């Protein structure tokens with residue numbers, strides 16, 4: 001019964017998931033004055049031309065746009081990564097107000113929302129085995145600010161009414177996730193965790209420096225989603241973000257000077 005409410009939010013998660021107080025928890029604050037350029041990094045390779053989206057699902061915590069991950073169709077490689085990571089889903093975290101909603105922060109700045117493109121390392125055969133490994137996942141994180149509309153997000157926004165409540169899903173084929181990326185692929189990277197229970201420490205984070213802009217109308221439609229199931233009291237799906245966690249014995253590396 002974890003969530004983001006008044007009595008089950010992030011500060012309670014440790015009771016059922018003790019790794020919430022672990023050594024490699026996410027998100028973190030990205031201090032641009034201490035992150036160091038790493039010349040050993042590569043450019044990222046984002047290969048989404050063959051991506052096959054399937055479905056969108058309201059899981060009661062966010063919504064996931066799900067992909068066919070049974071072949072190397074949409075993969076992330078390069079950067080800090082060894083091997084090939086397949087896109088399984090993306091989702092967002094967002095606020096009730098434009099001044100909060102992101103999970104990572106940059107010099108303590110909160111963005112309006114954050115996009116997570118979740119990928120798993122093909123050497124481990126399936127997602128569920130990957131999350132048991134320190135290098136099982138690679139999550140591409142992208143900040144959202146409110147400004148101009150993002151055209152490539154509109155198809156997502158216009159299906160949200162069909163998945164208002166927990167447990168609803170809808171067909172979601174032929175969505176191109178390239179329409180969610182900013183121009184630059186400059187990034188910060190560090191080792192961390194899933195940001196929801198079970199909070200497993202299996203993630204290579206790759207957080208893009210350049211945010212994307214979404215419109216106030218787009219964000220407002222996200223804020224009409226519900227945490228609750230149909231026929232239950234309405235609880236708006238807002239403020240579904242975990243705050244920054246202690247960096248501990250980690251370094252954040254930058255791909256750019």
Ligand SMILES: [Zn+2]
Nearest residue numbers: 091093116195
């Ligand atoms: Zn996430």
